[PDB]
Amino acid sequence: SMNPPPPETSNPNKPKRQTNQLQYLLRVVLKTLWKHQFAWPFQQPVDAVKLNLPDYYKIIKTPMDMGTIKKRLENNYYWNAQECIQDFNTMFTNCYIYNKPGDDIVLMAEALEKLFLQKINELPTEE
Numbered sequence: 001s002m003n004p005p006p007p008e009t010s011n012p013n014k015p016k017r018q019t020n021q022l023q024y025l026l027r028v029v030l031k032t033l034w035k036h037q038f039a040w041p042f043q044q045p046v047d048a049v050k051l052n053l054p055d056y057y058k059i060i061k062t063p064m065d066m067g068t069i070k071k072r073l074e075n076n077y078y079w080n081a082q083e084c085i086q087d088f089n090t091m092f093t094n095c096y097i098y099n100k101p102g103d104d105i106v107l108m109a110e111a112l113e114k115l116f117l118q119k120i121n122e123l124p125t126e127e
């Protein structure tokens with residue numbers, strides 16, 4: 001069995017910026033989720049080999065994780081906040097698609113998602 005390459009975190013020709021919203025996504029949103037007791041499964045790509053989940057990347061065709069998001073934010077990879085928000089939502093939705101309601105991993109994603117939603121509610125106006 002084999003893992004796919006991780007999502008892209010570097011691409012010189014891609015348009016990218018720093019915005020105050022993107023700075024908030026790193027300093028508030030990512031920092032908050034990353035320190036959470038339930039962050040650990042989401043801090044790097046799902047290792048389908050190590051976890052013995054050979055169907056994972058047959059089912060999940062747009063993988064995403066906070067390690068990837070962290071690198072994208074640190075590398076100023078994004079053009080806007082929406083792109084980054086989409087990555088978090090992809091991460092959570094993948095977990096719900098693959099797993100079943102009430103699984104520990106799903107409970108963990110729910111806790112992180114609740115906090116995500118509370119933080120992005122206070123996303124600053126772009127300035």
Ligand SMILES: Cc1noc(C)c1-c1ccc2c(c1)[C@](O)(c1ccccc1)CC2
Nearest residue numbers: 041042046051053094095098099104105
């Ligand atoms: C994120 C994620 N999304 O689907 C799976 C499976 C995972 C995943 C990623 C990493 C790990 C586990 C599950 C793991 O099987 C697990 C199981 C129950 C609770 C926490 C982590 C061990 C490490």
Ligand code: NA
Nearest residue numbers: 063064091094
């Ligand atoms: Na994923």
